[PDB]
Design a protein around this ligand. Structure first.
Ligand SMILES: Nc1ncnc2c1ncn2[C@@H]1O[C@H](COP(=O)(O)OP(=O)(O)OP(=O)(O)O)[C@@H](O)[C@H]1O
Ligand SMILES: Nc1ncnc2c1ncn2[C@@H]1O[C@H](COP(=O)(O)OP(=O)(O)O)[C@@H](O)[C@H]1O
Ligand SMILES: Nc1ncnc2c1ncn2[C@@H]1O[C@H](COP(=O)(O)OP(=O)(O)O)[C@@H](O)[C@H]1O
Ligand SMILES: [Mg+2]
Ligand SMILES: [Mg+2]
Ligand SMILES: [Mg+2]
Lengths: 456, 509, 86, 177, 51, 51, 456
């Protein structure tokens, strides 16, 4: 049956229905006359439901009639979604007309059971020196790009999409959650001009949209990826900012009548994150390989949101503002970054020893940096002076110009291989390049080009 | 002092009086507190709708509770009282728009406060709107010259970009944005300056400086001073944005400055606490991120198809844009505060101003290591794009090198070459206020540094060398500067032309 | 003065007009009043013990944690989204 | 929280019971008696005492009303007292009459004029309003010398102003703005 | 020196206009307060009943 | 210019002082929605003396 | 008509009036049996209004009758206020009889319009070296003196009152907002014995007073200054402590039913400050030169009250406890203090370059503090050693013995002209005094006296 809007406060709306006809939790409602949808968050009792609007509330009035749809927000799924741009409710947001849908799935679902979990360890090459060395990825696994504001999350995700998505022969889903509308336009024209668009389903919910949209766009993109996984396919899932799902819950939490927790976050922070993150997984039916960008408020990795996110991922790549502030790119921290695949029984002893060797040299240099700044370089030991020079060179050889960064760097882009990466770092550790100047390793792809840059 | 004219002006309001009956929805004032009015009976009031009170006072509906309506007054509230009637206008908040606003000072509702007469605009538009979607935009690839070489070379701004100006109190944030507005008087870009929570004498001084530099005729000034209602201070950025969007939607370019988004956030926090909405991270409303993201996503570049559709084919083959320069104030350099954290995460780049560099005499005070532009080389002309490639990251590495090699014994030629060059570019990036440079002037300065001509010049003489070189090229090479200033083009002919002129300059002056 | 308590709903008030002593007739049975964020408020269950298990339709179980003067606050030992008022 | 927010569950429960059992006129009289009796200076004092129990307050109010409360209405008073809501009785009666008026498709319209209008004019205004609103209209006509001429109609939240005072105010705002 | 002379000139017309408008409203109020009687309601209440 | 405004102001002031009556009767006639000459000129000569 | 007290909580009182006779916001009310004055702050509904008492509430009870006066608190203004002491309500508190007032003005007014603003830049010499060098004042402008407890705000204000009255010939208005009663007695007798009293209007609401008095005294003094400005005069407006106006607002905020903001402040902090601060301005009619002391809670300049005040001033003088601890008075900080008049187009290139030169030397000395603390001065470069020696001399030459501080030490006061100030610092920057000892610059007024002090 139908209900009436009784109260409106920001993005939250209360609707009253007959007591014999209260709509279910997460049920979708439609306002009469006005083009707006509501999602039931709670049943308040006495026939009233609390809901979040999936559109702006400026036109809404008390007393507007509302129709119960009998189900949760249902979006189109399958082959018809490829090469299309869509909103949270699954409507097409491109001028290409109606979607050729044959089936619709509700956005709210249970996670796969403990008995359905996959167990693969197949290594995935990324073409990026630091990542392939200390953060090796695997097919069907979860990757997180942690970092503050302005350190490279989108740029590294675009390089990873170029080096994986294009070459891959399965389907992809790209979800822009709380993203800049300019980045979404550049990426759409980039996928269209690269002829890759026919393999990708694009879902966009940018920063100009209401809290209800930003709170549910991640579930829409994941529902499309789950349809492909359950068909037995291998799928790629990209999420430009998963922090924006948590923030939309913080923005609305207090208006939903929930008391705040530490650092002003919603009390449901760990469960709302677990209900989403446990669905983003590879199963015995099919696989989902996923890369998520994770914003770190004020660069503090101890903030409740970033801190609760680490346990959900297989590979954790950490971007540092102090490295970016020195012109070094990609600005990845080899000491804080890690992966479940960095094991001699998964990769090999030669790779592992090179990675731990690089980490050992950089960890020792971190205590000497403060010594040199007060008492000078000459007071260090003969072994320390040599080690500091290698650490500063290693710190520069981590840098690499990307094809998607040519507009920022000016120089061309370099793809480097796993063996090339290992050989270059072993050479600097063993002392084969002690005679080369420190500036020769800055922005130069493989080890050969560093030997050539020293001559210029 | 013309008689009869005043009468006919009055007859024009008497002639058009609405003598017919009207059907309206109404309520009664229940309580009046701190700029907040509570009403009973407004059944058809929409969210954000204008409410009409006795004596032409207006309010806005923000809380539509089941049994009451919470409204904020768009002016002075102390004249309102319990029992007064509250009426309903079926219209959303609108402001006047058009070229008639250029060279005028107005309030947050568009009323003139300059006393220069009425604004004969022929078009109004809604203050609250949704920005154009993903498919209607176009990539940023046109420049917005600020006139400062440190900004235009290392942190470029393009038409439709959003660049944050951030630092502490009294270090040149307003000076950077006002000089950027002054430089547009000949660019063909319209300007908007929004003053939020400033004292009226500070606003009057900025307007006097725009007028003395000839930039006022190309600028709209929107004022919401410190004594005005928190509702007007909260709405002013959206009103100014709407006035800038008029040019964007018609295939024209505009620039907007929000002198303090941190003061808009403080005004929004006041209203929200008085409406009894639950507080967040520093007593700030839960939706303080959405306050700024809804404003800043409107500043954009729109495609030819969007302009052609908006103008019903009257304008064709032209893109439109709105560029934004929001300002944010930090406390003792603390960026971890809730509002600064939100805005740095929305803009297409930021310009960090440092008090230690400002006290050390580097007056534009731009920290090259922390400042960055997400559009980069696409927002620069060919000549500046080639002459400035890698300068930002080279200065970032020079600051580190200068600190690391400060107390060590004499180093190799690679270290001395990098250090001696970084010291010269550091002294070159210094500029005076109200003194912008053209593409050719910035180009000569960049060329003399990156091509090695400054290697023989003393650090204490870099400013004198640049000023003399520009003055010499202005007298003896005027036709070359005019060629560089047409589009900022570069080729072997211009490169050799600049080389020959700099060599002759150093060898004879 | 004070806001509405969980028992202050028209269906419960209308029941006390029919039979004033409607509750305490079946001290082992109650009705769901509200559902939100994994927490269920129930009217009745006058003899529930602190930490006892509550049985809901569909084989779903909960635990009694808030024995307030007017209602019981229970937490679901599984998925709560299938539960509803009444 | 407004008194209307707290009285809504109780007024709605009383209305639905009265409607289902065909007692709309009985509950209209009972709630009116309780609203008036609870506002009396001696009863208002008795209901605020801290030493009396909810059942003692309820019984005292039932014994005073007596004949006017049937078994269901007595049960309702004992329910309002147990939940500590006896202060809402005047608001519960007011909200019950609004639910009754809306059910019985009835509207009470207040009317004000500068000087008296004839029955011919009242019946012309009544048919026009009943045709516009699609409800039975009860015109509570009155006079107010503050109006220079004409009439003002107040049909609940809807207001229709045809008076000369309103036109003079429109002119003052048109010239001042 | 020229625009400011016109700035003062138009501001004086507006200062006068603000007083003349108040007087014109007061005049209309005094005129209607004497010109309106029982012969006007049969031409106003009757008009509203059609609106 | 300030001296010219100070010297000329009374010349326009006496012109608007005469027009107040015309603005008042035309405004009242608009508000009344019917001819007012038969009940306004005797009001003008008795009330205009106070403006 | 009249109302009845319904509730009393500290300084806040609720009064109920008939529905047709409810008093306006800011309207003054009087209690019948005690004549205590109340100011209406808000209308609560049902004929009830909330007010703040302009006196003590001890002995008041519920049910007392209250009379509405039909207007706001009105105070006497004009020539009759000169040489007299008044309270918040405009009553005389000097035992000299009634005020011979011609008119009274309400204490609440709107700020002058944008078209009424004045563009004055005329330099005002203070005779104090640090202020005239880095913080040049202007006639008709606003000055603020920021500082923690016991650092110099009252002493530096009393010295400025002494020096500005040398060139100024008009009237002055002094508003004592929440400070010591003894200091008001000392200032009154000093001016009475010096025959200066007949050109100064005095208003007081000191620390002994209830919250309502401390909250409105600032408005009473400003109302008298606005009368003299609007008469076409040039007047001085001095405020004992503007922070007390904001603090009196914090004590009452929770009683007014408002939700608190950051660190317990009222949500209306910036508006309460702007409504007062915007009235304190020069116009096309006359000018107001204003000087205000600003208390800094717990030495924290980032505290919401001091942080919100900086934007309302033309010149900012920041006092430091670290500088006061070394012996330097006035304890001004050149690197934190600033003025709108410090511009080459206002003060000329010679003054501007001298001031910029002093700030560059003091900034570089501040960067070396940690190195000098651990390793001492001997490890610095030959260039840094010379700069540190000049920084120490500049820091000492900024000190100056005051004519109001003579009682504390015994030393006679000094007045230094702008010409002598520029000449001294320019010589120290050029190196003309590199041979004189560091202690010769401490407490000596003009530069020539440093040369005579070095002879001992
Ligand atoms: N390029 C420059 N060269 C020299 N001085 C400068 C330069 N840029 C700014 N200044 C000066 O430094 C001060 C900066 O003031 P400005 O108002 O622009 O800073 P702000 O950060 O906006 O201050 P506020 O917090 O008060 O708004 C002014 O005195 C200005 O004249
Ligand atoms: N690999 C890179 N090479 C060069 N510049 C880079 C690189 N990564 C980031 N940057 C610079 O830093 C900016 C911020 O990167 P972006 O991915 O937008 O950050 P985030 O998403 O973490 O906020 C880019 O716009 C560019 O200017
Ligand atoms: N110029 C000065 N010379 C010497 N001592 C001073 C000077 N200024 C302040 N002091 C010392 O500091 C004390 C406190 O100064 P005061 O102005 O009362 O501080 P504040 O008003 O900031 O609390 C003085 O009593 C005196 O001992
Ligand atoms: Mg990003
Ligand atoms: Mg500024
Ligand atoms: Mg003191």
């Amino acid at each position: 049956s139908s209900g009436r809007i009784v109260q409106i406060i920001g993005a939250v709306i209360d609707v009253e229905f007959p007591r014999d006809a209260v709509p279910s939790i997460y049920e979708a409602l439609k306002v009469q006359g006005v083009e707006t949808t509501l999602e039931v968050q709670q049943q308040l009792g006495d026939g009233v439901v609390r809901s979040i609007a999936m559109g702006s509330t400026e036109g809404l009035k008390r007393g507007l009639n509302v129709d119960s749809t009998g189900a949760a927000i249902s979006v189109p799924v399958g082959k018809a979604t490829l090469g299309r741009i869509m909103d949270v409710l699954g409507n097409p947001i491109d001028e290409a007309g109606p979607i050729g849908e044959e089936e619709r799935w509700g956005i709210h679902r249970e996670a796969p059971s403990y008995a359905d979990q996959a167990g693969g360890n197949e290594l995935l090459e990324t073409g990026i020196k630091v990542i392939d060395l200390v953060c090796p990825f695997a097919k069907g696994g979860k990757v997180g790009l942690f970092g503050g504001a302005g350190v490279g999350k989108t740029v590294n995700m675009m390089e990873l999409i170029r080096n994986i998505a294009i070459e891959h022969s399965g389907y992809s889903v790209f979800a822009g959650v709380g993203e800049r509308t300019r980045e979404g336009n550049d990426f759409y024209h980039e996928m269209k001009d690269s002829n890759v668009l026919d393999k990708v389903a694009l879902v966009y919910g940018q920063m100009n949209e209401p809290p209800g949209n930003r709170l549910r766009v991640a579930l829409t993109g994941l529902t499309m990826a789950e349809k492909f996984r359950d068909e037995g396919r291998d799928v790629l899932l990209f999420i430009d900012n998963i922090y924006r799902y948590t923030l939309a819950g913080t923005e609305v939490s207090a208006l939903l009548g929930r008391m705040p927790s530490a650092v002003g976050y919603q009390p449901t922070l760990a469960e709302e994150m677990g209900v989403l993150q446990e669905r983003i997984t590879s199963t015995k039916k099919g696989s989902i390989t996923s890369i998520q960008a994770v914003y770190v408020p004020a660069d503090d990795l101890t903030d409740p949101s970033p801190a609760t996110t680490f346990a959900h991922l297989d590979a954790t790549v950490v971007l540092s503002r102090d490295i970016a502030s020195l012109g070094i790119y990609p600005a990845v921290d080899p000491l804080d970054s890690t992966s479940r695949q960095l094991d001699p029984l998964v990769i090999g002893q030669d790779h592992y020893d090179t990675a731990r060797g690089v980490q050992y040299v950089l960890q020792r240099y971190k205590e000497l940096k403060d010594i040199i700044a007060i008492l000078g370089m000459d007071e260090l030991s003969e072994a320390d002076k040599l080690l500091v020079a290698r650490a500063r060179k290693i710190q520069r050889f981590l840098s690499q110009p990307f094809f998607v960064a040519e507009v920022f760097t000016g120089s061309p882009g370099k793809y480097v291989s796993l063996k090339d990466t290992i050989a270059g770092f072993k050479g600097i550790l063993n002392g084969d390049y002690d005679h080369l100047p420190e500036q020769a390793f800055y922005m130069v792809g493989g080890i050969e080009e560093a030997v050539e840059k020293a001559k210029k | 002092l013309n008689p009869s004219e005043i009468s006919e002006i009055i007859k024009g309001r008497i002639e058009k009086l609405d003598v017919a009956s009207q059907a309206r929805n109404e309520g009664t004032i229940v309580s009046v507190s701190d700029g907040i009015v509570r009403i009973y009976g407004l059944a058809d009031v929409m969210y954000g709708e204008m409410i009409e009170f006795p004596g032409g006072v207006y309010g806005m509906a923000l809380n539509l509770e089941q049994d009451s309506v919470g409204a904020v007054v768009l002016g002075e509230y102390q004249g309102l009282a319990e029992g007064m009637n509250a009426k309903c206008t079926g219209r959303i908040l609108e402001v006047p728009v058009g070229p008639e606003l250029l060279g005028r000072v107005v309030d947050a509702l568009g009323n003139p406060i300059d006393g220069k007469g009425p604004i004969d605009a022929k078009a109004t538009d809604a203050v609250e709107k949704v920005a154009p979607g993903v498919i209607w935009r176009k990539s940023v690839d046109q420049p917005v010259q600020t006139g400062y070489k440190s900004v235009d070379a290392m942190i470029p701004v393009g038409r439709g970009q959003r660049e944050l100006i951030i630092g502490d109190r009294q270090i040149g944030k307003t000076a950077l944005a006002v000089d950027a507005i002054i430089n547009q008087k000949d660019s063909g870009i319209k300007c908007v300056y929004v003053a939020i929570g400033q004292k009226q004498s500070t606003i009057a001084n900025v307007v006097r400086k725009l007028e003395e530099n000839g930039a006022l005729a190309n600028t709209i000034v929107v004022a919401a001073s410190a004594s005005e209602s928190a509702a007007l201070q909260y709405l002013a950025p959206y009103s100014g944005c709407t006035m800038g969007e008029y040019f964007r939607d018609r295939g024209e370019d505009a620039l907007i400055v929000y002198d303090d988004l941190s003061k808009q956030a403080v005004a929004y926090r006041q209203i929200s606490l008085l409406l009894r909405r639950p507080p967040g991270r520093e007593a700030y409303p839960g939706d303080v991120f959405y306050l700024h993201s809804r404003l800043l996503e409107r500043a954009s570049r729109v495609s030819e198809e969007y302009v052609e559709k908006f103008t019903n084919g009257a304008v064709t083959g032209k893109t439109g844009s709105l560029t934004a320069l929001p300002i944010i104030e930090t406390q003792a350099g603390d960026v971890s505060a809730f509002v600064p954290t939100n805005v740095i995460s929305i803009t297409d780049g930021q310009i960090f101003l440092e008090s230690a560099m400002f006290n050390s005499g580097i007056r534009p005070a731009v920290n090259a290591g922390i400042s960055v532009s997400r559009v980069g080389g696409a927002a620069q002309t060919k000549i500046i794009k080639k002459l400035s490639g890698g300068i930002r990251t080279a200065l970032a590495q020079y600051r580190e090198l200068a600190a690391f090699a400060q107390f060590a014994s004499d180093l190799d030629e690679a270290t001395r070459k990098q250090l001696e060059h970084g010291q010269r570019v550091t002294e070159l990036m210094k500029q005076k206020q109200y003194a912008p440079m053209s593409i050719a002037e910035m180009s000569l300065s960049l060329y003399a540094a990156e091509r090695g001509f400054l290697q023989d010049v003393e650090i204490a003489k870099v400013g004198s060398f640049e000023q003399a070189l520009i003055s010499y090229f202005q007298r003896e090479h005027a036709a070359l500067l005019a060629k560089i200033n047409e589009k900022g083009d570069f080729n072997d002919e211009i490169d050799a032309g600049i080389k020959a002129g700099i060599e002759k300059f150093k060898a004879t002056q | 003065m004070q806001q509405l308590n969980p028992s202050e709903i028209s269906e419960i008030i209308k029941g006390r007009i029919e039979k004033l002593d409607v509750a305490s007739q079946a001290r082992n049975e109650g009705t769901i009043v509200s559902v939100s964020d994994g927490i269920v408020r129930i009217y009745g269950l006058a003899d529930v013990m602190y930490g006892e298990m509550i049985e809901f339709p569909g084989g779903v179980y909960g635990m009694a944690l808030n024995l307030e003067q007017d209602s019981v606050g229970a937490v679901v030992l599984g998925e709560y989204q299938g539960l509803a008022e009444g | 929280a407004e008194l209307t927010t707290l009285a809504r569950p109780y007024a709605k429960a009383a209305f639905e019971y009265a409607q289902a059992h065909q007692q709309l006129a009985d509950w209209s009289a009972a709630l009116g008696v309780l609203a008036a009796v609870s506002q009396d200076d001696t009863v208002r004092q008795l209901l605020k005492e801290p030493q009396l129990t909810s059942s003692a307050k309820a019984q005292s109010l039932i014994d005073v009303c007596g004949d006017k409360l049937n078994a269901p209405a007595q049960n309702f008073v004992r329910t309002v007292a147990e939940n500590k809501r006896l202060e809402l009785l005047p608001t519960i009666a007011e909200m019950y009459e609004q639910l009754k008026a809306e059910q019985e498709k009835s509207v009470e319209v207040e009317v004000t004029s500068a000087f008296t209008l004839s029955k011919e004019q009242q019946d012309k205004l009544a048919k026009a309003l009943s045709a516009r609103l699609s409800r039975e209209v009860r015109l509570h006509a009155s006079e107010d010398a503050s109006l220079i001429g004409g009439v003002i109609i107040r049909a609940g939240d809807l207001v229709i102003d045809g008076s000369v005072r309103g036109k003079l105010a429109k002119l003052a705002e048109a010239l001042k703005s | 020196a020229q625009a400011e002379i016109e700035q003062e000139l138009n501001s004086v017309k507006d200062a006068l206009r603000a007083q003349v408008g108040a007087l014109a409203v007061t005049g209309a109020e005094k005129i209607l307060g004497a010109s309106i009687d029982a012969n006007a309601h049969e031409q106003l209440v009757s008009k509203l009943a059609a609106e």
